[PDB]
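ping. complex inputs:
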Amino acid sequence: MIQRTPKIQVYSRHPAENGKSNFLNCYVSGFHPSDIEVDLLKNGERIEKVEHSDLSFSKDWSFYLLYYTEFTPTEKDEYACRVNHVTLSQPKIVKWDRDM
Amino acid sequence: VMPLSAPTL
Amino acid sequence: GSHSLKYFHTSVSRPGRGEPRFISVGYVDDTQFVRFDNDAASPRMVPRAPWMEQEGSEYWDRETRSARDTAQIFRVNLRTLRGYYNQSEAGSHTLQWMHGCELGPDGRFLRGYEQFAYDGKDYLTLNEDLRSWTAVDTAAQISEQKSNDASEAEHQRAYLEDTCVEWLHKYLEKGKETLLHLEPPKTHVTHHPISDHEATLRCWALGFYPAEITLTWQQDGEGHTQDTELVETRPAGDGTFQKWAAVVVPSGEEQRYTCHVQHEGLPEPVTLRW
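pong. complex structure:
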């Protein structure tokens, strides 16, 4: 009945410094139902082993999750988050922009 | 701690 | 200030893919401290904050029992609710349960709440007196009647006013070194031209705890600029939070804009400019 589309933010734990260790985060929120797949990509390829927070929800009942992995950013490497949710026409790719 | 009673609907 | 002990419970039916998935998470304020997830063999309530690691078997055994029993009751509830709404076994459905107690600044109970949602909407709510319920429709009216039969509000009132408050105080003591530490935001401004005529000013607040913050842009030292681009406050992943706010301004007019940050950890509000 009610389905709500995920909000997606892709970002680093600390402001990115090329060659320095960090965490890449994909925060998905505001969604219903709770079934969702969130994949972190490096140069188009899915990072096989990433971790996530425990499923929780806000006052309005909508769910949120954090997916995260260790990474060392460089100039040449592109990172993105891919989100698979029933509300989307196709999996949505959001690129990491180190200014957002 | 969580409640010791879970409501039946 | 005020403190809260809250839990968020979710059960989702997975037709022909096993039994419902059940997950419980507990928070003190903005800090998760426990979880239970039955998507696993021999599932247990487990610590999710360092200061809970010291808790003994008495605690984990009791909390696992409660979570397992809740999962079972939610399993049954999911079948019932399909019954009430004339839904087949084919679709997936969600039952959510949230509850919490809140202490005021004076360190005593101020408020308790409990609510249920089915398929992402209000179903059954505990009233402010903690002695009666509000039902959204004729199905929830049956659940209300079952609750009244079972004196369920009395059980939940005793948890909210007594147990929840007792344990919130315990947790605040156990985790005080972090839970009662205000971590102010580290703030900065970024500046990127968009065209010959316009530029983006972005105000960052990083590394702060608790999550509550106000970040605003002001034009000409009063009010807030309309159409400020805000993002939802987001987790850093280390127990702190991040947020930013951006405005698009005419080139050369950057000195008219100030970013204003309020946070419990700041002695006074911070004002930044480019």
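Residues 1-100 of chain A form a domain with the Immunoglobulin-like fold (CATH 2.60.40.10).
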